């Protein structure tokens, strides 16, 4: 299968239960499932990513994204846009910050990623 991304999700899920949710994002925001046929693996990933964002306090967002790497930003925006489809409007509020503080280029790069 090569879906060891299924071992990356439990960490983030627990990182919600504990309290420090952002820690889980910094976790799953490494080594994401590249485009495939098997979306069922990616869906369970996306499901976690948006669940993580849902319980990160608004005040903590500008501090994370400012510390984040450009790979991480391009990646986080990339999932925000895939997240907007059916998941809350909290995503839309993330989109607002990770654009205003990390530039428009992030979206431009999301526009490429195959």
Q: Dihedral sign, CA of 105, 9, 4, 81? A: negative
In this chain, which stretch among 13-21, 26-34, 39-47, 80-88 interacts with another protein, using CB under 8 A? 80-88
Between 6 and 66, name the residue whose CB sits nearer to another protein: 66
Give min distance, CB of 104 to another protein, in A: 6
Element at 91 (helix H, strand E): helix 90-100
HSE of 109, CA atoms in CB hemisphere, 13 A: 16
Q: Provide the binding-site residues for another protein, judged by CB under 8 A.
A: 70, 74, 81, 84-86, 89, 92-93, 95-96, 99, 102-114
């Amino acid at each position: 299968v090569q879906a060891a991304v299924s071992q990356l999700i439990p960490q983030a899920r627990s990182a919600i239960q504990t309290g420090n949710a952002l820690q889980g994002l910094k976790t799953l925001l490494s080594y994401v499932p590249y485009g495939n046929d098997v979306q069922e693996v990616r869906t369970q990933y996306l499901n976690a990513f948006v669940d993580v964002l849902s319980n990160i306090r608004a005040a903590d967002i500008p501090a994370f994204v400012k510390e984040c790497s450009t790979e991480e930003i391009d990646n986080i925006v990339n999932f925000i846009y895939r997240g907007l489809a059916n998941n809350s409007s909290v995503l839309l509020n993330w989109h607002e910050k990770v654009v205003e503080i990390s530039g428009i280029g992030c979206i431009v790069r999301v526009l490429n990623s195959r």
